[PDB]
Amino acid sequence: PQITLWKRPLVTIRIGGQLKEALLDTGADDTVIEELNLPGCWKPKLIGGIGGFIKVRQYDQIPVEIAGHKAIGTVLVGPTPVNIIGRNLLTQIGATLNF
């Protein structure tokens, strides 16, 4: 699709077999999802945003479907304010910015 930015670019994703809403975020290096359980082992990581740093669980090689497009990559799980799809998965679905 082509998505304009007059509203937040919120889309439906599938991850761990569950539906979630997430923000397509070109300002995020990584994909960060609210607390949930994912299958597999994870490792602890810290990541930072405008407000400071948070602790997250890093899961690798996780299938994520974004608006019907498939990705398989790293998902960080933790106390993010909003679920965000970052560049590590946006590149996998061929998303670009255009103007």
Side-chain angles (χ1 to χ4, degrees), residues 1-35 37-45 47-99:
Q2 168 165 275
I3 297 169
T4 63
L5 293 169
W6 300 97
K7 313 191 207 208
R8 298 185 297 165
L10 291 162
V11 300
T12 299
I13 74 173
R14 306 208 298 99
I15 179 176
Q18 180 190 47
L19 307 182
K20 302 194 156 276
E21 171 173 79
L23 183 67
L24 303 180
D25 190 352
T26 60
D29 293 352
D30 312 303
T31 292
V32 194
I33 305 302
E34 69 196 318
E35 295 181 351
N37 291 306
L38 270 175
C41 285
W42 51 267
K43 69 178 155 201
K45 195 187 185 166
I47 50 164
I50 156 179
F53 283 82
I54 63 173
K55 154 75 168 70
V56 297
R57 298 180 187 203
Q58 178 169 331
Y59 295 92
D60 295 320
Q61 214 166 318
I62 302 292
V64 184
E65 186 159 14
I66 302 156
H69 287 71
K70 284 175 184 60
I72 305 177
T74 297
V75 177
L76 311 178
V77 177
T80 179
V82 174
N83 298 329
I84 329 147
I85 306 303
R87 294 185 298 102
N88 73 303
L89 307 180
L90 295 172
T91 52
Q92 292 198 17
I93 71 185
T96 56
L97 285 161
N98 298 263
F99 62 95

